Write a protein that binds this ligand. Structure first.
Ligand SMILES: Nc1ccc2c(c1)S(=O)(=O)C=C2
Ligand SMILES: Nc1ccc2c(c1)S(=O)(=O)C=C2
Lengths: 264, 266
């Protein structure tokens, strides 16, 4: 992998592995999401790191508020997929990281993703707007003119997600993270929540449809000793669902989302 | 990745990923086990196989290879961003089945950082009945194996061939109600063998994991966990720290795996 010529974006190629694919012999959306995370990590390392001395001094970290992925073609087992990533400042709100996925052999865009990140105190979990001093330290690593993976003026990446009402049409209860679901800091990996959301989709939908779009909002973190319930209701050629992840006991919301599926 | 010059073994390099490491910023034993599986798959493809390593004779009789035992020893877990080189080969073990071995090395130093061995047996994919290999099938795979013995674990009467006892109730530690999600399934909708390693490790206390490093794991595979099954993971200290393990179905207590782990103080 490497930064591009202008040093404002990062590209990396990946060969799809045997254990990374589903029943269609193509990469699952969780493998794709892990690869997005990996190319994001490699981008931060290549530019010198994604926390500066100033963020480290104030105990601030970047946390994901929203993730939006659209896949036109899932790469097959043994195929090479090229992923390009970049960041852009969104004023005082936070930052946005975008991705473009391409088939390395044809050069055609097979997918795209966008994510919203906000600054949070590591210890108190309190959110805050971006200070001018912190924002100005990261601007030298972003393209200055807008560069959007989802340009469309009415794109599904910025749609507001409602809260699922009980009773849910489908459910998967008692979901718990194991050590493989944790990152190097013992926190639940963001991709695990995507897997948990998908667990409440019926197997018949998964067997006859392909996931085209997933939008996920992150409200609260699942701790290593928490238990989660995954709720889904059909809202809809295509099938659309509304999703909710909440703690098994008190019903505290951890995520909400939407998925769009197309017939195979 | 590629077959070596003699075409009797396969080598592949991997760069360790950010999501593949644990709290020590080194690859977990589950990432290592997935890489062993991946280099095994790439070896079968390189020697001509289009399912897993099944010849047309096995395909006509509906026979598949299934893991009976997995044994892994790690001296050093590769760090995040490091390149690890893995070499794999197979050997026929007469009529019993086959053995697949692996050697892990640090690509920069060339030193052996780990080794693994596994026992595979032939099974009918529909009835799940075990069978001897027979001359006709064994003779079709011999051209892909070294003829002289080549063992990742040469030592006479070593840890890889030790008999594992059945854990007696009550267990010292336990993790109950473990269930597979879609990410735990392979391309044939069966639970991936590496998930059972994760489930075994779930009943080790967090304090042991925080102060020790896993050096050895031996796992026997008795029965498969189905997509709608629920598993209990049981562990008792038998001692470094050594543990005896048992995975069984949550309800009727049917055994699915038994194993042992050996851990070294950090
Ligand atoms: N906040 C922020 C802005 C740009 C960039 C990063 C962080 S990075 O370090 O991940 C690569 C470029
Ligand atoms: N059964 C068996 C024996 C040798 C070899 C394989 C299978 S393979 O196809 O994985 C490569 C060598």
């Amino acid at each position: 992998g490497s930064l591009t010529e202008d040093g404002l974006s990062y590209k990396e190629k990946f060969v799809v592995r045997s254990y990374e694919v589903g029943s269609n012999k193509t990469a699952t959306v969780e493998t794709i999401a892990n690869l997005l995370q990996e190319v994001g990590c490699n981008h931060a390392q290549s530019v010198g790191f994604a926390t500066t001395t100033t963020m480290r001094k104030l105990h601030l970290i970047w946390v994901t508020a929203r993730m939006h992925i659209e896949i036109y073609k899932y790469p097959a087992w043994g195929d090479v997929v090229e992923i390009e990533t970049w960041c852009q400042s969104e004023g005082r709100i936070g930052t946005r990281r975008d991705w473009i996925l391409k088939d390395s052999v044809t050069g055609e865009v097979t997918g795209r993703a966008t994510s919203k990140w906000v600054m949070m105190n590591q210890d108190t979990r309190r959110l805050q707007k971006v200070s001018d001093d912190v924002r100005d330290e990261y601007l030298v690593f972003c393209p200055q003119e807008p560069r959007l993976a989802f340009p469309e003026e009415n794109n599904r990446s910025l749609k507001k997600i409602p809260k699922l009402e009980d009773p849910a049409q489908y459910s998967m209860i008692g979901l718990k993270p194991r050590r493989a679901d944790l990152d190097m800091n013992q926190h639940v990996n963001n991709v695990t929540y995507i897997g948990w959301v998908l667990e409440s989709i019926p197997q018949e939908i998964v067997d006859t449809h392909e996931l085209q779009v997933i939008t996920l909002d992150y409200r609260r973190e699942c701790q290593q000793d928490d238990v989660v319930d995954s709720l889904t209701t059909t809202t809809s050629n295509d099938s659309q669902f509304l999703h909710l992840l909440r703690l098994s006991g008190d019903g505290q919301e951890i995520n909400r989302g939407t998925t769009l599926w197309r017939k195979k």
